[PDB]
Every structure is written in C-alpha cells, then in structure tokens.
Assembly symmetry: C3
Homo-oligomer: 273 residues x 3
C-alpha cells in the first residue's frame, strides 16, 4: 500500500491532476500546513496534494511551514512525497524548460527550522541527527528518469540544488560562486523540505524545472519573477504529464524493504536521554 504526497511549487501546483478530489484542512503540532490537503487518485493510486505556497501563492519561501507540511503528509499516511520546484539553471546544458531529477543539495538557507526534534514537542522526543549522504529516494528518481525518457522530455538524471534563503535572487558574484561549489540549479525551497521528509521516513523526490539561467551570464538577460512565471506557463504541462505517468508505476513497484530501511535510518538517528 503506497500513498503519494505531492507538493506543488511555483506555477506547478494544479489540483486538476487528481481525480475524485476532496479538500481536507488539517492541523499539526507545528501549526497549519500551507493550505488544505487535496485527497484524490491518479489511476488506482491514493495521492495527497499540497500547494507549497498556498493555492494563491501568498507565502514567501523563508516563511513556508516545512514542518507542518511534511508532518501533515506523514499523518495522512503518505509513504512517498514527489514535489515540483521552479529553479534557475547554473549550467549551460540545463536549458529553460528542462527537468532535473536532483540528487544532492547545498544549503544556503539561514532562518529555517530543519528538524522535528526541536525539544518543544512530545510528538518528537530527543535529539535527531539525520544522515544526508543520499537525500533523495533513488528508486523514485529512477522511475522519474525512465518516465521522462518514455515521454520524450529533455531531462537531466542528476543535479545539485543550492537552496538560498531569499526572497531576493542571488547576486552575480553569488551565482558565479555557487557554480564553483558544484551547484547545478538554484531555488529557495528544497531545504529543509528534503531534510524533514528524511526524518519522517518518507521516500522523497523532486522534479526541478529550470526557468532561467539565474544571472551568471553577464552578457545575457538576468532572472526576474516575470521571466520565471512565463517559462512555467509554457512548460507546466511537462511536470503534470511526468507526475501522471510516474505515479501509477510507483503504485505497482514493491516498496516494503526501501520503506523499512528509511524507517530504521530515521529511528536510529534519534538520541534519547
């Protein structure tokens, strides 16, 4: 039995992807999620959709309640979380409209709670030091990659996401610097979403859609909100088709040992008194 949480990003949070939709507002020990949970199905697979920024895109990336979002999806019974994120490209070969099935991150965030085990909640007791060597679910990523190929979509099979605090975009000196560090794409939302999913023992994967080349091409036009939203309007259908085609394959794969190993990794990461 699998149940797929879907966290929709900028321009990529369309509830019409699910059949048999029911709105459910929930609460958590960390406050309210970004919006109502949307319960529904893709073919025979139970899904839960959540708009990262609220359905009106009213919440700034620093202030998104990552804890409540992941807690809510876990509590509703999600075994997997697949998300979409709009991002800047830091590599010539990653063109606007390309999908990147990211496998690493570099944290540049500063103001964000990254753990459920913050001492303030009986629900999560102790100190948790979650391993981050392999932040994204390899098996889910493999299915996404194979499915993107079956769909004929321009897709990158790996990539390192640098997550900045925002809400400002990067300076050119920062953009250049992130490239030297080995970052391939840039956003404001992967961290700590990925970290909290791991603490929850959830199989997490991310569909990153490149929308611009940030500003590391001095000669070329720099990123702006209008440029990002334009690219997403033109390419959103690709992420939608990828999710729609991927999720039924996830539903027919065997997951008990993968989920058992995540559960164990999460459990043994906790130091108790």
């Amino acid at each position: 039995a699998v149940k797929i949480g879907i966290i929709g990003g900028t321009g990529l949070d369309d509830p019409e992807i699910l059949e048999g939709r029911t709105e459910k507002y929930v609460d958590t020990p960390f406050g309210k999620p970004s919006d109502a949970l949307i319960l529904g199905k893709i073919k025979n697979v139970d899904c839960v959709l959540l708009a990262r920024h609220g359905r009106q895109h009213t919440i700034m990336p620093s202030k998104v309640n990552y804890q409540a979002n992941i807690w809510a999806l876990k509590e509703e019974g999600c075994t997997h979380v697949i998300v979409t994120t709009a991002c800047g490209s830091l590599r010539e070969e990653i063109q606007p409209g390309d999908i990147v099935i990211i496998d690493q991150f570099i944290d540049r965030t500063t103001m964000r709670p990254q753990s459920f085990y913050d001492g303030s909640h009986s629900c999560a007791r102790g100190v948790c030091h979650i391993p981050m060597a392999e932040p994204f679910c390899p098996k889910t990523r493999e299915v996404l990659i194979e499915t993107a190929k079956k769909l004929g979509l321009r897709c990158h099979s790996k990539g390192t996401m640098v997550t900045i605090e925002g809400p400002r975009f990067s300076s050119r000196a920062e953009s250049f610097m992130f490239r030297t560090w080995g970052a391939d794409v840039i956003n404001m939302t992967t961290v700590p979403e990925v970290v909290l999913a791991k603490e929850a023992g959830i199989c997490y994967a991310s569909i990153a859609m490149a929308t611009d080349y940030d500003c590391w091409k001095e000669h070329e036009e720099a990123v702006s909100v209008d440029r990002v939203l334009k690219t997403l309007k033109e390419n959103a259908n690709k992420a939608k088709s990828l999710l729609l085609t991927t999720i039924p394959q996830i539903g027919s794969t065997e997951w008990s040992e993968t989920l058992h190993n995540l559960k164990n990794m999460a459990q043994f990461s906790v130091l108790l008194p």
Copy 2:
C-alpha cells in the same frame, strides 16, 4: 528633482558635511531608524544624512534596523542613496586608505530580514523576489569613480564585498576562503542595506574604505578595532571630499529613465494573491 540619502558608516558619518542642517526624528512601519535624519544641502542638492550605527556608534551590525533606515530615506523622498562603509581588504593591491566603488556582494549574514515584504505590514503586500544581478547603481558608481580620479585619490573601479554577520571578525581560514570565492573586501553592513534599497526603487551606491588587510596575511598584523579606527581617522577626509564633490554632479545629471527602470523592476518583482 533628486534627493540624496547619505548613510554614514564607522568613522564616516560626520553631519558637518551638510549645510543648512535640521534634525528630524521619524518612525516607520519597521520601527525607528538608527538615529535622527539630518536634512541639509550640498550646494543646491537636497540631502538626508543618517548615521548607520547611531551618532554615538552604539548599534552592532546584526542589530542595525536596515528596513527602517531605507524606509525612512524613501519616505523623506530620497531618489538616491550613497553610503560609506569601513572594510577589510582581501587583495594586496587594495591598500588601507584606498576607496573601492563596489559592484557586487557575497552574503554571509544569517540573522537579517532582507525584504520589506515579510507578510506583517499592509504597506508592502505580497511576496517580493528582487533581482540582484546588478545590485549597485551603475550611473552613480561611474560619477564616484570619475570624481575620485578628479580628486587624485587611490580608487578601485569595481569590487566584490563579502558581508559577514559579525560582530566577530573572520578567522584566517574564513579570510582565505573568501578570497577563493572571489571576494575583494569584507564588512558587516552592505547586506541587506543594498537589497532593501533595490526593493525601494532607490539608486544605491557604496564608498568602501579599506582599513586593514583582514587576517589572510599570517606573517602580517591582523585586524582589530583600534587598527580600523586609526585608518579611518587618517583617511575620513577622502570620503568626505568624494561625497561633497560627487553629489552636485548627481544633481545636474538626468535621472528620470534610470529611476523609472528601478521603479518598474521593484514593482514587477512583487507577486500578488
């Protein structure tokens, strides 16, 4: 009609630069500015002076109210902001006493609000993602550079400022590392002052005065407060003369299209519900 905000940094916030001075305490939706606004003139040009650290230098760089400072200058009608900042040199060729007309930054701050659009104020509604490819006003920088030359002052026509959280100085390992990232000078105040100015549609430029070589020369003597203040006492007159000579030239240049483009960039960076 131009009006020039001046934000004076460490050792470089002397109200006697303005003629016809009047003190004005103001409030903002983000709290009180660092000190009273000082209204005055340089030749025929209306100016507003503000001590970044208060006139007694009592406020630590992490706790400076960057939001209130920029909001106050905008509300008083400033079209431009030119600031002074004391900084460490990360490059042999940038000697103590040199001026650097910086054109880029790298953020190393952690605890600082960087946007007016924080959800908590009716004055600034929505989510703002300001572009930072070109953080400093090119036209103002050009006039500063040309004016420094006319004055015979040692001046660098570009430079990348790394802004650290402080209030501690950097370790030697950090100083070395910032050099590899492409930083040329180091301070505790450029970010988020520059970011907020951009959100306000203000033409912002910075006169950085090198006061020391930080600590990347192991063999040489490391930075300290006394070393910084000594260099500033010896060289403050240079920043004063540069401001006094620059501002009248700004006053006689045409600015409507430059200011229109900043206004547009700021306006279109805001996502509304």
Copy 3:
C-alpha cells in the same frame, strides 16, 4: 594561579576524570548552563567540568547555551578552557580515533548568538568586534600536541574545523564543498564556543576526536549516530588520558603575560558610546 574549565562533548564528558568532585548549579545573565558545574582537581590543579549537552545528552547543538556555558566558567575563575568534540574527518589521513588539535574554524552556523555584547545586558556594554585570526590558544595547543606524542597517540598538530548548524548531517555535495574550502574536520559545536571564550579573555583549546569520514567517500559507508557513538566508546579513553596528563603541565607553566594579552585583546575590542 590557573583554573581549567573542561567542556565535555559527545561521549567525552565523564565526571570521573576529576578527584574531589562537588556539583554546583549556577545561573548567568544569559540563562542556565547546560548542566551543573563539577568542581574538582587533577593532581593539584583546580578544574571545572561542564557537559556541553547536559549529562544525559538531551540538548541539540543549535540550542546549546554557549553564552551561559562560557560565562559560568569565567565567573567560577577559569583561566583556561580545554574541550572535547566528536567530529567527522574530511581528510584521508585523519582516521577515526585520531585526535586533531584544531587551529582554525570555518563558520556554517546560522541561528547562534556569538557575542556577549548583544545590547541586552548591563554586564557587557557596547559593541564588541573580537579578532579571530588566532582562535585557539597556541601555548595550550603545543602542550596538548607534545602530550599526545608522549602518550603514543595518533594526533594531528593542526586542522580546520567547519561547524555546521545541524542537527542534520551534511549532504555529500556539502561534504565535498567543505573539502575544497580547506576544512579538515566537521562538527556542530566549535562555533560559537571558541568565539565567546575569546571575548571572555580565556585561553581556549579543543581536542577533536575523529569518529567517521562524514560522507565524501561515496563508495564507503556514510556517518550515522550509531557509527559516531561506537567510535567514541572505543576511543574515549584517549581523550581522558590526554586531559589527565596535559592539565598538570598547564598548571606548572607560566601564564600571566599570555592571559594579560588575551585580556587586552578582549578589552580593546569593545566600542563604548
């Protein structure tokens, strides 16, 4: 007259190192220390032991009260602080179980007060900009190094510690990146402990014990809590013997000029109104 504060880290905070032990709970202007102070002696040398994480290891590295810990040790009369810390190795030659007498740090923390001079306490008035070129006491480090040699222990005579916010471990992209920056070992606790010790005019040194290779060897097994605690159980005796043998040598060295110079550096780092 010397008095040695000992801050015990993960797996390395055993009160049985001291003779003639007395528990003393104290308060400070920054709140309660992590646990009771343990007053005692090593040979004729007065010591004060403090468990960084509390004696039950219940406090996460982000939430440790570094200010109260250092203030408490200073107030009890400590001239020196020697600490233990568990860390990941970022260098092939630094093997699990090796000691590293670190001499530099790179800060990657985000949420942490790093100064006593935060404006909120009459006890520490003004703005303090402490120099960090030489964060660790050279004379104490020399004695630690010589003593490790006399004990036949695998020991590294220098090293750069990167301190991450945690409580998560690093991603592989982060681990790789820290190596390119020149970090040799990785933990969650050196900063701001070292910074506050310097502001207090205390001779501070750190015994870092490598417990794992973080995750920069993709082919090899990644760090986890169980792996860390296992290595510490096997090697804790080494840190204990090093402290026991080092402290009496510290007690018979002359320290007045070293301590005078730290006192002066701390005092002159403060800007008053």
